[PDB]
């Protein structure tokens, strides 16, 4: 997170941290006790599929306190339309092995109802993104959780204001943009998968997932997020199906 502040321990309760072999992988969001949402590319180079764990309650990555809860990740389901290496359909649903215990430091984020997302959350200007990712384009990752408040833009104004190229994907209907273009504030490497949360009348819902669009805090660019609205249906359906036989699972999308 570039330009962010430290999240007052306990104010980001839906933040997950995924680990592989002990090393940080991505971030993720907790939508319910056994389900976490993250970013599909984080599973592009995983060949140690059982050495993947998720931590909740986490805050300061250097000391252990009485809060962190860790569960192995039993399954990882990605749209069957995601392409290994892209930013389109960058969403993953992770089924834990055992649920977590909600506590003051572990609560889920509401996965909003599509219509409400599209029609109401989407015109709430500011949302929060959080993580323990680099604090500057290529600087140190963080130890305490950092959260950034960004403004969202509609593709027309994003396209309108971005500089023209780099080997960029397009902002498809499965993405949106948020950020500043004066390379001051942005999500960054290490924040992948983490949340973009909108606060509407007292509750926070998951409006986006930190994807990897823009190396990190560039100029003339905005950060790109996966538009969750386009996937509520899909997630929901997956969350009620029988366990099926695979760690990585590529579910049909839509």
């Amino acid at each position: 997170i570039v330009g962010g502040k430290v999240c007052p321990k306990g104010e980001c309760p839906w933040q997950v941290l995924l680990l592989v072999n002990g090393a940080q992988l991505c971030g993720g969001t907790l939508i319910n006790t056994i389900w976490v949402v993250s970013a599909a590319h984080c599973f592009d180079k995983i060949k140690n599929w059982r050495n993947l764990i998720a931590v909740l309650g986490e805050h300061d990555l250097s000391e252990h306190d009485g809060d962190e809860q860790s569960r192995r990740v039993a399954q990882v389901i990605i749209p069957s339309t995601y392409v290994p290496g892209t930013t389109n359909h960058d969403i993953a649903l992770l089924r834990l092995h055992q649920p977590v215990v909600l506590t003051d430091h572990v609560v889920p984020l509401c996965l909003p109802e599509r219509t409400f997302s599209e029609r109401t959350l989407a015109f709430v200007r500011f949302s929060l993104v959080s993580g323990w990712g680099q604090l500057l384009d290529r600087g140190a990752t963080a130890l305490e959780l950092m959260v950034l408040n960004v403004p969202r833009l509609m593709t027309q104004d994003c396209l309108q204001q971005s500089r023209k190229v780099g080997d960029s994907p397009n902002i498809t209907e499965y993405m949106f943009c948020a950020g500043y273009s004066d390379g001051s504030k942005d999500s960054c490497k290490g924040d992948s998968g983490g949340p973009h949360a909108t606060h509407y009348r007292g509750t926070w819902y998951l409006t986006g997932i930190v994807s990897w669009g823009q190396g990190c805090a560039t100029v003339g660019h905005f950060g790109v997020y996966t538009r969750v609205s386009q996937y509520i249906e899909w997630l929901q359906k997956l969350m009620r199906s029988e366990p099926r036989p695979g760690v990585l699972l590529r579910a049909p999308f839509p």
Binding site: E11, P13, I31, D104, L109, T120
Partner: protein
Amino acid sequence: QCASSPCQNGGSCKDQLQSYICFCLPAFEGRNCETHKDDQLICVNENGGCEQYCSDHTGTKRSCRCHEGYSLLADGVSCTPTVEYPCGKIPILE
């Protein structure tokens, strides 16, 4: 212009250089105090007034709803949680 009383719903007209200004009453707006503020109770208009979800129905009022873990209250707009750690609430700021 004013002479030709263009302001409706109680509004007063003020003349200008051919133009006029209509001063409407609290429940109406528009150039000629004609739009009624209480006829746009739709889900696209400030979420229908619902705290969490809203639904518009054919010829009948829109209904508000709640997210899993909450119950709509008496007023039909506000939801309250029925659980301990209802989603999207931050226990330490509660």
